[PDB]
Design a protein around this ligand. Structure first.
Ligand code: CA
Ligand code: CL
Length: 496
């Protein structure tokens, strides 16, 4: 039995970023910035040939309808993909492919992003090739429309069609061989791993058979005898017949409870309290940290498609709370952390649903994607926000230390350290707090890395609101003056 939940990073790097709908040429350039800020890797949008949808015009979700396993996509050509992987790998920033193996397209016919035909009505995908024998059908699914409705029926969830997406027969030797060939081709070029889409809709045994066909990582960059990193998108918020714990033996699993819980806590939904995070992690009924890929939001649930709709998940639209939740997640020790990196779109919530949730990335038209320019009102670039990247540095400095010196106000203020390496005071109250705490840190002069550029004087005021220096006393205590409001947190850490 091979296990795929271990990932590989350069020393001092750990956090990964989803550069959602970024072009390969932009990711290739971004790898320098990411390396300089000690991020470990990038999840890239599905790079295989996908459906081109023109009604509505070029939505993001067309990339979740495979047409073939060639490598010309909205983000760029095979040549551009391979240039990106090579450059990023040489910089020590690795690439995880969003791998879409559960299904092909929905109904209708057309061509994909590399010119190959699809026909979801006849189940013909000549670019693979797949035909009807390669799919589940009326022999395998008994619902009246062929779609999934009863999430208490694992057979229905796995063998019927997710919203009409034609469902591949993952038990078939041919499908397993074809999908492994796709993954192995990408591994051979230098891809480090995969985010596997829609895994709740596949049988773990079929995933095991596909993963057993995989070659090990390319030793131009990776250690000999290393399996690819696999993290599996399994949406499991409890009370269903498919469980995230079915997939952890194969690799890591997305823990959607993490962002649900942190979102509810930071929003103070239904009387939640920041102080309740004292035991956050597996003890909240979540996966063990070692089995989990964690994140505040993803591309689906920032569009209201997760549970609670728009009322729980935090996103760049709620920037102040989003930074609080992300800072906590990065300072804590639980899971492999992925940060979303988003684009803006005309979100328009009507009766709880965003009417414009289909809108694709910044475009001049014609299905192209604009070059990224961070902070221009179109590309959000959360991973480049100082509050994020300085908390990634905090996370890196703190690595391997326990949570220590926990404090809270019984309510909406907590503070904790990571050994003798870092300390964060989070005041989520509607009033200011002055509090002296054992920070666990060596005595000295520290800067708040939430508001300042550097961890020690000179503090650096590029953001314009760098707070006064924090003095840690000789006994390890420090006095935190934390006003409520924007960025209502102070994080300090020893020199990297
Ligand atoms: Ca399926
Ligand atoms: Cl995901």
């Amino acid at each position: 039995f091979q296990y795929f939940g271990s990932y590989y990073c350069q020393p001092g790097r750990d956090v990964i970023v989803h550069l959602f709908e970024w072009k390969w040429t932009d990711i290739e350039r971004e790898c320098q910035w990411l390396a300089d800020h000690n991020y470990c890797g990038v999840q890239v949008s599905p790079p295989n040939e996908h459906r081109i949808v023109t009604d509505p015009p070029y939505p993001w979700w067309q990339r979740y309808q495979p047409v073939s396993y060639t490598m010309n996509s909205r983000s760029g050509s095979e040549t551009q993909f391979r240039n990106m992987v090579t450059t990023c790998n040489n910089l020590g920033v690795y690439i995880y492919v969003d791998g879409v193996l559960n299904h092909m397209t929905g109904g209708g016919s057309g061509t994909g992003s590399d010119g190959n035909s699809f026909d979801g009505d006849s189940l013909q995908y000549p670019g693979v090739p797949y035909g009807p024998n390669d799919f589940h059908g009326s022999d395998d699914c008994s619902t009246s429309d062929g779609e999934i409705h009863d999430y208490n029926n694992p057979t229905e969830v796995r063998n019927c069609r997710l919203s009409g997406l034609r469902d591949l027969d993952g038990s078939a030797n041919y499908v397993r061989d074809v999908e492994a060939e796709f993954a192995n081709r990408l591994i051979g070029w230098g891809v480090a791993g995969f985010r596997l889409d829609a895994c709740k809709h596949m049988w773990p045994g079929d995933l095991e058979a596909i993963l057993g066909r995989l070659n090990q990582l390319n030793t131009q960059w990776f250690p000999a005898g290393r399996n690819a990193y696999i993290y599996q998108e399994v949406i499991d918020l409890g009370g269903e017949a498919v469980k995230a714990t079915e997939y952890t033996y194969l690799g890591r699993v997305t823990e959607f409870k993490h962002g649900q819980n942190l979102g509810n806590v930071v929003r103070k939904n239904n009387g939640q309290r920041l102080a309740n995070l004292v035991n956050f992690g597996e003890g909240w009924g979540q996966l063990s940290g070692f089995d989990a890929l964690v994140f505040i939001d993803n591309h689906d649930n920032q569009r209201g498609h997760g549970a609670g709709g728009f009322g729980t998940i935090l996103t760049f639209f709620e920037a102040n709370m989003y930074k609080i939740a992300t800072a906590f997640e990065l300072a804590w020790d639980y899971g492999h952390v992925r940060l979303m990196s988003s684009y803006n779109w005309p979100r328009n919530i009507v009766n709880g649903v965003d009417t414009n949730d289909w809108v694709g990335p910044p475009t001049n038209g014609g299905g192209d994607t604009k070059d990224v320019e961070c902070f221009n009102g179109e590309w959000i670039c959360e991973h480049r926000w100082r509050e994020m990247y300085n908390m990634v540095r905090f996370h890196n400095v703190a690595i391997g230390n326990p949570v220590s010196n926990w404090w809270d106000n019984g309510f909406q203020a907590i503070a904790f350290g990571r050994g003798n390496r870092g300390f964060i005071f989070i005041n989520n109250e509607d009033f200011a707090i002055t509090q002296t705490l054992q920070t666990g840190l060596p005595g000295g002069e520290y800067c708040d890395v939430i508001s300042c550029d550097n961890n020690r004087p000179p503090c650096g005021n590029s953001g314009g609101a760098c707070r006064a220096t924090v003095i840690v006393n000789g006994d390890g205590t420090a006095t935190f003056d934390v006003p409520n409001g924007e960025n209502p947190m102070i994080a300090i850490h020893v020199f990297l």
